[PDB]
Each structure stands twice: as structure tokens, then as C-alpha cells.
Design a protein around this ligand. Structure first.
Ligand SMILES: [Ca+2]
Lengths: 145, 156, 808
């Protein structure tokens, strides 16, 4: 939890500070509409406001870290996840054998739902009936590509 | 009936690990009662394990923690779990010329052909893991093998 | 030790390491493998199926067949450690079955030798085998029995050393009929005593100067018997002498118990001695007329009662070598005549007919009498007169004439036998003269060849006589055993709770010798004119029917399966005897006048009859009484030769014939005796090395004491203290103790291996444990990291700092 650490807490500092041009520190509807503009996407009021409801009211940054109290739960780190996947890859990268990973998440350990299984194949970096981990670790945070 | 608080905490630890690998649900598969038991630190024979619950296949039966605990302690009620004396007098039966050396083709024959048979794979492994070598024809030290097998994968 | 299971010579005594480990490791189970009775071939190996009440079910090995054998018929078989065993004394299960096996399995792998207690058994291999090399001789020279494997030589070098260690005369008692090599064997033993005379590190060989005589003694002492083509009907003891340095210094031959009777009586398929059918042949027609006969073995009561010839026999050739041998031994072609003529006389002493008038008998011819009178060189008148009439005394001299017909016929028969007996002693005195090219004798190692123990379908006065002899022989053995085992126990400090073993045969022996026993009942019943085969029977029954265990009585058999009148329990088993004719067969009365007169003319009959009225039995007794006085003054050794099969077919065993020989042999009696005592005896080390696995402990095997471990292993198994005793150097066991111990070890060892395997599985898994542990760390991360992602991928805000920052 507090594991919304420094790297996690300063990275969140530049973030709230950009959406800025500010109302002495207030991720604003405007600071927002001004951003999703330079983001280039589509700003819906009711909605844009729906983002507000999440914080009681008035988002400085103290509230910004509090809002991200769904992020911190898992949030295990960068590398830590790579090593984790590593373990189940014996043949150096190109990564893990699909089947395995299925018998792995689906019926070994904290079992996945047949519903959770798909929520994963849809995207999934794949080929040769073999999975890609530094690619999935990637999606996790989000470099992109 | 007796396992101490710490004894339990210990069985638990191992127990969880096992229910973890087969799906954290509070149950472990009878097939795994042998292994689990081995992880607590015991060395049971297959007869021992079957006479105490171990099933052979995998869908058959399951055990909560409170069911395994008494197995652990009945199992722990035995005492010819086996010593060195017991392993030494038995290797000697095979030591043809009286030094403590035994062809490996032979120790392996013992281990694979007799008693609760041991796998080809299992033999190679225990033999690679203990650092037990044969020399020209001064076959294998049987005591070397005894001390190490009885010392654990994680010596120190 | 001193054996390399490899010195190629040992190919037939030994059995090599690989081969032994091979025999020593075959499969086995003590709760099921066993010995079971087999009609066709003795005892066979099997496995126990089901029990229930007193009726066991079994399945046999070599043929498969589920038979239903009874409880007291399942033989505990010995475990593998005992296969090809060298001394059956060491066997843990000492039953017939088991004795059969050890001996068989060794003959069937080329080994003809197998020790059983004091005995040295040796089977006929029927084929030359390397066994008698002068190189082996040295592999055996000076060694005590355990150092080498079983070998006839071991018993001689020892018989030889003892002669020196204890300065005692030694004897070798060898048994075995027809094809057993009792022959080669006696030869090979006299040979060996010779080779060792070169042993102090610096016209005939002995074997030969002695083998030279065997033809002549055989013509007068051997003959066919229902069950044997050439049976020595006398006992010979070849005494090989030595000087104080172990130096061979001579030999001579003592003879015992020549079977007179045969001289005037045949049993259907039997025959008088060989020589009779020998003289009367063609390589010597000439002699056939000096003697006074017509080449026709039939034509003579003292020769025709039984058979004419013997299948696979050519008298001629024998009357041949017999004669050639008579010269080699060196004696007067003239002497050679007397012996012959003397023999011939017996042929006539049978024609000598008779008739009577009231109660005085008279001739019914006279050619026959001057034929005898002449051949002997005495005056027929005086003969006929002293046979038919006689004059004796008190101070004056009355006509003892009593004589009737039933009386003279005997008198004549007895003359014959008496002639033959003096002739035979004579013949022997001679080869001895041939042998005495001596210096000075100090000791001896005699070899005794006696009869054996006969059990026929029809045993009569002859069988009893012989059995009385072996009974006293087996006893001699029992007694030696007794004396040794007694020291053996004391050497170890074990308590000896035993009465002489010899005594177990005294009952029977007594039932024969003892004043008012079989023989003495016979003798007295011999002095009663109207006595009868029946008068004698009752007096036997009267005296010993319910009153003595040994004495029994059979029960009518098969119309022809003769009538038996009583049976004795002999060490060799139970023998049933027929009484018909003993009264007639036993009378062998001396007729004084015939001697003083026979104390006339022709030179041999001067040395012969020059050197009351009695009986065969009384003589038998006296002779036997002597053989024993002599055997008991010697340190004995026992060799047991054995006929393996009725048909010379090397490597073949007939269970019945062999067992039969065993019960007679005395071999099985010894096992019986070993039985009641502690036959298994182990040195604490041999025990230390074999059973420690049964009660292992942390004390380094080497600093440990054998006795202590032995002791401690035996308590832990809570084995009955009666089942064993502890000696200063060995632990004595009873029956099956080792049998059990062997089976507990197989058990225990198997358990200990599963266990080791158990420790491996424990190692292998305990190693995987750390991994699994690691891999739980991982997966938890992956599910606790993916799941949030499956959520978070929809938190608008989430999308933003995912954009909001790459753009920092
Ligand atoms: Ca589970």
C-alpha cells in the first residue's frame, strides 16, 4: 500500500503538474480539457466530471496519491515481474510455452477463471504457440508497441 | 494430541506450498502426501505412505491441514526410519573385496532392481547431486554416497 | 585357506568364485520353498500353496504339479548360503531330503566329494577325472582339513599326520558295494601313503606288490551274491607300515570273517566262491585230472546248489589271471597244486555218500572216499573208520561210534569248510610273506574292507551275521564321534549333557550277543535232536516278544513273499528275518579223530591241520570280537564310497539307491546324532560379518568384538536360549537357527534398501522444495500483477498517466 513509493510518487508529481497550468495545484476540468487536447482524443463533460466523483472533491495531489489507491495494491515492480516470468522460461526468451502458461494460471496456484483466461488471450503477445514475457511485463506498466 | 504450536506452524508452511501448487483452496492431493511429508523432513517408504492415506493418482482424494497433521504424527511415530548402521551393514553385503567400494553398475542395480524400485532418472540425479564419482575401476564409495544422501540437498 | 578357486586343477573339487556367488544367490523364500517326497526321484523341491488342518498343498519346481503332501512330509529346505556346501554337518536343516540334495547338486556339477561330519563321502563319477595329481598331492600335503576342499587325500594326510602327532596306529574304514571304487580308492590311498615317504624335504611299487595279490584272494574269498557279481565274503585289513620318520616300511594283510558256510551251500541266484568254477576250465585240462574231476560245475553238491556262471563273466580268463598271479606272488607250481588238489578234495567230500542200519551209518560207495583219502594223503580205511566210527576215551577208549546218518553228512560238510578255512588263512600268510621284505615296523594305517549292511527281500542267518557286524561297526563310529564332540564342547566351555552315542546300538547288539539272546538261543536249540525251525522260533518269541523294544515280528506277506519270523531295529533301519534252517546252517562241529589223522601225509595238510563240536555263530562272535579289539586300538577315519546309479551313467543320481546306502553307511546315523546336539558352530567373526545387519549400531564395525555382537544380535531377536550356546570361539546353534537368521537378514536387507531409497526421494524432493518455494513467489507476483492490469486497463485516469508521462 504505502508502496506508492517515491519512484511511484514523483512520477505522479510530474503527471499532475502537467495537466497543470494551474489553479494553485488543482487537476482541473480545464487543466484536464487542456490536456486531453494535447493528448488528442475526445472530451465528454458528464464523463470528464465522472473522473472527478472519484475524489470527494478538489484534487490537489495529496488527493492525487490517494486516488491512486487501486494502483498501489499490486504494483509489484518493473524487474521483479520480469524475474517472475523468467522462472517459467527455461529456453531463453522467445519466452514461455503457451500450454504451460495455461496449466500454470488456469489450474495451478491462485487459479484463473476461464473468464480471466480469455481476458488475457485477446491481447497476448504470441506466435509459434509460444508466449512473450518482456512483452507482457511491458504491457503491464506500458511502454506500448 | 501433541504436535507443538511450532510443529503445526511448520506443517502449515509446507502444507500451503503444496495447496498453492495445485490451486490455493485449503486442500492438498493425497498423491502429494508423500512429498509433503518429505518436505517436513521425513523419509517415508511407499508402503508407509499408502498405509497412511497416500493415493497414487490425482483426482482421487484431498486433505485439509487438520487431516494431514495427524498423518504427520502417526507417521512420525515410527522409529526404524533408518540409521547409518542400518545403511552400512547393508551396503557391505555387496562389498566384494572389503574396502567400501562397490561397482556402480551394482549400487544402481540395487537401487533400480531391488526394494521399492527407483527410476533410472532418479538414480542419475541423486548421483550427480551428491558428487559421487567412480574412478578407473575403483568403482564407487558407498559411504560417500551414504553421508551425502543423508545430508540433504542444502548441506550448509 | 590355500585355495584359489582358479588353479584349473580345482575345476572338480572347488567351484569358482563367480560360480559360487552364482549358486549362493539364486532365488529363495523361507515361508514357502521346500523339500517334498517324490516317488520317481527321492525328494524334490517345491513351494507351499495353502494350509488347513493337517494337509498341506504345494506346487513343485522342475515339473510343476500341485500335490497334496501331509504336514509331517514338508521338508524345510536349506537357504542359498548352503548350496554346493562342502560339509553337510554345517547344513542348517539336516533332513534326508537335505542330505540328498547337497550330495546330488554336487555330483551333478562334477563334484564327487562331500564331507558329512567325520565321514568323507565320495561318489563314483564313472570316468577318469584329474583329481590324482602329484601337484595336487602337494596342494594337500600337510594341510588340516579346512585349508582345502573335500578330497580323499585330505583324510590320508591327516591319518598320516596323526600317526606322527600322536604316535598311534591309524585305521581307515571304507564302505560301498559293486561300483563305488572302494577299489581304486583303497588303491589311491596306499599310493598316497607312499608318495609322502619322500616327504621329509629330501620289482614293485607298494600299490602293485599289493594289487598283485588281489586276484588270488579274490578267487577264494569273493563270489556272486543275489545282488552283487563279485562280493568279497571276507574282511580284509591292509596294514601299511611306517618307521619313526613317517617312512614307509612295509605292509601285510589281516583277514577276518571268511564266510565258511558258502563252501557247502547256495541260494538260488548265488554261487560258491569263484575259484571252484575257475579250476574246472580249459587252460588246464591237465590239472582237472590230478585233482580228479570232469569240467562240469554242475555235478557237485558242494558247488551246484545255486548258479553256474555269472552274466558278463568268463571263468577261464579268471582261472587264467588267477594262476598267473599265483606265480607272481612266487609260489611253487607244486604248492599251487596242493592248494588246487586240496580244493578239488572239497568237490569230492561231497560225493562221499552214506546209509544206515538202525542208528549206525556206513558208506554207500568208496571211490569218492579214496579220492578224498588220496588227495589228502591219509588212509581211507582210517578215514571211513574215523568218520563212520571213531574211538575216544576216559582213560580207556570207547567207540564214540554214536554216529548216524544225520551226523556224518554234517561231519563231512564241516571237514570241507575246515579245509577251506585253513587253506585261506594259509593263502594269506603267503602274500604276507611276499610283503614282508621288511626292515622294522613301528606303526600302521590299516584299511578295512568289510561286508556292509544287507537288507534283502529275504534276509536269513547270513544277513543277521553281517548286520551284527556292521551294528558293532556303526557303534565304533558313534563312539568316536562321542569322544570328539565331547572334547569339542569342552574346548569351548559348553555343557556336555550326553551319554555315549555308542550306546544307542547296544540294545540291538545285546539282543544278538547276550546270554539268552538270538545267537545263544540258536546255539542251545542246536543241541536238541528233534529241535526244529519252529522249536527255535517259539523260544525266540517266548524270551523276547513283548519284553524288548528292538525285537519285533512281521506279518505274512505275498504267498511267496516269504515268511519272516522277527525283525530287529538296526541303526540302518528295521530288518525282518526268516528263521527257516538256522539250526541246520549253524552246526559246524569239530571231529577230533579227523584232525589227528588229518595230521598225516602230504606237506600242506601237515602245516594246515597241524597249526564240544561248535558253531558258525560262536566263530563269527570270536572273529568279530577280534576285529573290534583291533579297531578300537586305532584312531579311525571313515571313507564312504557310493554307487550313484544302477547303470554306469555318469552324473546320474538314483535317490533310492543313494539313500539306501546312506542309512546303512552310518552316514545318516551321524546326522541323527548331530541332530540332537548343536551341529552348527560359527566363529564369532563369521557371525559378525553375516548378521550384524540384524542389530546394527554406531560402533565402527572394526573396533567391535565378535562375541559381543553375536551375543547382542541373538538377544534382540529374543531367540530361545535353548536354541544356542556360546563358546570361547564359536556360537553353537541347533536346527534351523541359521535357517531363521538367514531369512531375517534377507528380510531386513530388503527393508533397509527401501529405506535408503526413501532417503533419496527425500533428498530429491527436498531439493525441489526450494524451487517450488521460489516459483510460488513468482506466480503470486504474476497473478497479483495481471489481475490488477485486467482491472486497471479501464481506469480512465490510468490511461492518462500512461500518456501524461511519456510526454513529460
Ligand atoms: Ca489447493
Amino acid at each position: 500500500r504505502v508502496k506508492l513509493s517515491q519512484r511511484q510518487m514523483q512520477e505522479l508529481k510530474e503527471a499532475f503538474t502537467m495537466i497543470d497550468q494551474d489553479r494553485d495545484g488543482f487537476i482541473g476540468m480545464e487543466d484536464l480539457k487542456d490536456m486531453f487536447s494535447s493528448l488528442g482524443r475526445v472530451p465528454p463533460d458528464d464523463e470528464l466530471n465522472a473522473m472527478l466523483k472519484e475524489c470527494p472533491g478538489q484534487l490537489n495531489f495529496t488527493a492525487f496519491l490517494t486516488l491512486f489507491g487501486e494502483k498501489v495494491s499490486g504494483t509489484d515492480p518493473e524487474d521483479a515481474l520480469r524475474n517472475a516470468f523468467s522462472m517459467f522460461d527455461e529456453d531463453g526468451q522467445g519466452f514461455i510455452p503457451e500450454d504451460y502458461l495455461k496449466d500454470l494460471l488456469e489450474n495451478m496456484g491462485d487459479n484463473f477463471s476461464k473468464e480471466e483466461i480469455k481476458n488475457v488471450w485477446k491481447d497476448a503477445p504470441l506466435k509459434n504457440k509460444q508466449f512473450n514475457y518482456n512483452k507482457m511485463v511491458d504491457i503491464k506498466g506500458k511502454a506500448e508497441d | 494430541s501433541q504436535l507443538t504450536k511450532d510443529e503445526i506452524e511448520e506443517v502449515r508452511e509446507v502444507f500451503d506450498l503444496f495447496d498453492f501448487w495445485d490451486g490455493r483452496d485449503g486442500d492438498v492431493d493425497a498423491a502429494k502426501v508423500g512429498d509433503l511429508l518429505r518436505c517436513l523432513g521425513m523419509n517415508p517408504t511407499e508402503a508407509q505412505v499408502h498405509q497412511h492415506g497416500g493415493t497414487k493418482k490425482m483426482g482421487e482424494k484431498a486433505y485439509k491441514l487438520e487431516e494431514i497433521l495427524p498423518i504427520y504424527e502417526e507417521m512420525s511415530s515410527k522409529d526404524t526410519g533408518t540409521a547409518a548402521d542400518e545403511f552400512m551393514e547393508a551396503f557391505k553385503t555387496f562389498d566384494r573385496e572389503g574396502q567400501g567400494l562397490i561397482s556402480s553398475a551394482e549400487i544402481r542395480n540395487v537401487l533400480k532392481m531391488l526394494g521399492e524400485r527407483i527410476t533410472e532418472d532418479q538414480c542419475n540425479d541423486i548421483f550427480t547431486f551428491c558428487d559421487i564419482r567412480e574412478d578407473i575401476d575403483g568403482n564407487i564409495k558407498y559411504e560417500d554416497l551414504m553421508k551425502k544422501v543423508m545430508a540433504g540437498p542444502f548441506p550448509d | 585357506m590355500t585355495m584359489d578357486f582358479s588353479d584349473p586343477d580345482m575345476e572338480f573339487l572347488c567351484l569358482t568364485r563367480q560360480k559360487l556367488m552364482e549358486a549362493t544367490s539364486i532365488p529363495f523364500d523361507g515361508k514357502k520353498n521346500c523339500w517334498v517326497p517324490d516317488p520317481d526321484f527321492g525328494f524334490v523341491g517345491a513351494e507351499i500353496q495353502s494350509t488347513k488342518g493337517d494337509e498341506v498343498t504345494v506346487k513343485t519346481d522342475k515339473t510343476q504339479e500341485t500335490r497334496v503332501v501331509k504336514k509331517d512330509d514338508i521338508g524345510q529346505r536349506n537357504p542359498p548360503k548352503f548350496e554346493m556346501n562342502m560339509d553337510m554337518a554345517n547344513l542348517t536343516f539336516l533332513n534326508e531330503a537335505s542330505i540328498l540334495h547337497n550330495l546330488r547338486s554336487r555330483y551333478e556339477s562334477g563334484f564327487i566329494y562331500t564331507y558329512s561330519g567325520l565321514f568323507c563321502i565320495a561318489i563314483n563319477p564313472y570316468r577318469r577325472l584329474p583329481i590324482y595329481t602329484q601337484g595336487l598331492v602337494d596342494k594337500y600335503r600337510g594341510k588340516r582339513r579346512a585349508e582345502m576342499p573335500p578330497h580323499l587325500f585330505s583324510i590320508a594326510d591327516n591319518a598320516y599326520q596323526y600317526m606322527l602327532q600322536d604316535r598311534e596306529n591309524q585305521s581307515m574304514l571304507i564302505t560301498g558295494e559293486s561300483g563305488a571304487g572302494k577299489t581304486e580308492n583303497t588303491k589311491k590311498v596306499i599310493q598316497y601313503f607312499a608318495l609322502v615317504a619322500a616327504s621329509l624335504a629330501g620289482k614293485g611299487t607298494l600299490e602293485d606288490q599289493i594289487v598283485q595279490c588281489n586276484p588270488v584272494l579274490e578267487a577264494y574269498g569273493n563270489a556272486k551274491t543275489t545282488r552283487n557279481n563279485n562280493s568279497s565274503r571276507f574282511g580284509k585289513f591292509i596294514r601299511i607300515h611306517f618307521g619313526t620318520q613317517g617312512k614307509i616300511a612295509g605292509a601285510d594283510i589281516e583277514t577276518y570273517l571268511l564266510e565258511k558256510s558258502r563252501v557247502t551251500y547256495q541260494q538260488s541266484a548265488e554261487r560258491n566262491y569263484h575259484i571252484f568254477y575257475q579250476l574246472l576250465s580249459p587252460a588246464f585240462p591237465e590239472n582237472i585230472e590230478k585233482i580228479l574231476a570232469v569240467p562240469d560245475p554242475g555235478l557237485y553238491g558242494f558247488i551246484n546248489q545255486g548258479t553256474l556262471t555269472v552274466d558278463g563273466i568268463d571263468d577261464e580268463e579268471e582261472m587264467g589271471l588267477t594262476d598267473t598271479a599265483f606265480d607272481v606272488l612266487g609260489f611253487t607250481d607244486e604248492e599251487k597244486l596242493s592248494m588246487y588238489k586240496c580244493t578239488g578234495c572239497i568237490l569230492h567230500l561231497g560225493e562221499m555218500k552214506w546209509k544206515q542200519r538202525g542208528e549206525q551209518a556206513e558208506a554207500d560207495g568208496t571211490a569218492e572216499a579214496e579220492k578224498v583219502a588220496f588227495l589228502l594223503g591219509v588212509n581211507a580205511g582210517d578215514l571211513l573208520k574215523c568218520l563212520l566210527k571213531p574211538k575216544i576215551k576216559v582213560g580207556t577208549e570207547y567207540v564214540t561210534q554214536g554216529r548216524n546218518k544225520d551226523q556224518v553228512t554234517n561231519s563231512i560238510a564241516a571237514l570241507a569248510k575246515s579245509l577251506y578255512d585253513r587253506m585261506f588263512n594259509w593263502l594269506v600268510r603267503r602274500v604276507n610273506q611276499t610283503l614282508d621284505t621288511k626292515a622294522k615296523r613301528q606303526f600302521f594305517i590299516g584299511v578295512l574292507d568289510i561286508a556292509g549292511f544287507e537288507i534283502f527281500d529275504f534276509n536269513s542267518f547270513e544277513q543277521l551275521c553281517i548286520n551284527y557286524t556292521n551294528e558293532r561297526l556303526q557303534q565304533f563310529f558313534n563312539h568316536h564321534m562321542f569322544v570328539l564332540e565331547q572334547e569339542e564342547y569342552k574346548k569351548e566351555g559348553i555343557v556336555w549333557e550326553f551319554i555315549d552315542f555308542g550306546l544307542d546300538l547296544q540294545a540291538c547288539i545285546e539282543l544278538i550277543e547276550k546270554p539268552m539272546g538270538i545267537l545263544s538261543i540258536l546255539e542251545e536249540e542246536c543241541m536238541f535232536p528233534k529241535a526244529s525251525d519252529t522249536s527255535f522260533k517259539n523260544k525266540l518269541y517266548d524270551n523276547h516278544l513283548g519284553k524288548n523294544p528292538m525285537f519285533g515280528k512281521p506279518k505274512p506277506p505275498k504267498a511267496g513273499c516269504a515268511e519272516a519270523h522277527f525283525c530287529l531295529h538296526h541303526y540302518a533301519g528295521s530288518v525282518s528275518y526268516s528263521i527257516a534252517g538256522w539250526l541246520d546252517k549253524n552246526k559246524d562241529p569239530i571231529n577230533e579223530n579227523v584232525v589227528e589223522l588229518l595230521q598225516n601225509s602230504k606237506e600242506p595238510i601237515v602245516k594246515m591241520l597241524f597249526t564240544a563240536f561248535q558253531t558258525i555263530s560262536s566263530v563269527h562272535k570270536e572273529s568279530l570280537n577280534k576285529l573290534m579289539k583291533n579297531l578300537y586300538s586305532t584312531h579311525p577315519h571313515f571313507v564312504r564310497c557310493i554307487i550313484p546309479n544302477e547303470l554306469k551313467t555318469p552324473g546320474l543320481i538314483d535317490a533310492a539307491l543313494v539313500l539306501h546306502q546312506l542309512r546303512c553307511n552310518g552316514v545318516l546315523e551321524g546326522i541323527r546324532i548331530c541332530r540332537k546336539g548343536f551341529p552348527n558352530r560359527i566363529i564369532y567373526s563369521e557371525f559378525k560379518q553375516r548378521y550384524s545387519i540384524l542389530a546394527p549400531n554406531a560402533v565402527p564395525s572394526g573396533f567391535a568384538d565378535g562375541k559381543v555382537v553375536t551375543d547382542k544380535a541373538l538377544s534382540a531377536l529374543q531367540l530361545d536360549p535353548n536354541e544356542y550356546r556360546l563358546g570361547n570361539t564359536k556360537v553353537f546353534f541347533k536346527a534351523g537357527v541359521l535357517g531363521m537368521l538367514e531369512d531375517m537378514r534377507d528380510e531386513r536387507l530388503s527393508k533397509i534398501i527401501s529405506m535408503f531409497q526413501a532417503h533419496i526421494r527425500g533428498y530429491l524432493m527436498r531439493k525441489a522444495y526450494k524451487k517450488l518455494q521460489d516459483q510460488r513467489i513468482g506466480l503470486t507476483l504474476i497473478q497479483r500483477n495481471v489481475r490488477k492490469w485486467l482491472v486497471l486497463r479501464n481506469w480512465e485516469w490510468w490511461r492518462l498517466f500512461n500518456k501524461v508521462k511519456p510526454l513529460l
